Amino acid sequence: TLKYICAECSSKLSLSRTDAVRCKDCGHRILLKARTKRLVQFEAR
């Protein structure tokens, strides 16, 4: 499923729509979505 990261643990999680948004390792309720896999282009100017 979609990947998230615990705000405290930094552990990686995979959560579905019905999953409660918590960190399995520590129970923190704040999660940050993972970086996109599509390449990002930046002009160096």
Partner 1 sequence: MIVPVRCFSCGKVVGDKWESYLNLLQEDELDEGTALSRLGLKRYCCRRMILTHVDLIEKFLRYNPLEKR
Partner 2 sequence: EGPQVKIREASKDNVDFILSNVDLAMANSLRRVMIAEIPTLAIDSVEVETNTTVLADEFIAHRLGLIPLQSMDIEQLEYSRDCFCEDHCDKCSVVLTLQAFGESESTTNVYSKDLVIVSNLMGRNIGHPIIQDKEGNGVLICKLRKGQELKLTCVAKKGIAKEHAKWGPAAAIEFEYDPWNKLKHTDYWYEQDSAKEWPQSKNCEYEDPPNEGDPFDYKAQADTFYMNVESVGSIPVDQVVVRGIDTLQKKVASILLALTQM
Binding site for Zn ion (CB under 5 A): 6, 8-9, 23, 25-26, 28
Instruction: Return the number of the residue (18 or 41) whose C-beta is nearest partner 2.
Output: 41
Torsion angle of the four alpha carbons 13, 4, 12, 26, in this order, in degrees rounded to the nearest 10: -70
Residues engaged in binding partner 1 (CB under 8 A): 5, 7, 10, 32, 34-35
Q: Which of 8, 36, 4, 9 is nearest to 20 (CA)?
A: 4
38 forms part of the interface with partner 2 (CB under 8 A): no
Could you tell me which residues are annotated as the binding site for Zn(2+)? 6, 9, 23, 26
Could you tell me which residues are annotated as the binding site? 6, 9, 23, 26
**Backbone φ and ψ of 38, nearest 5°:** -70, 140
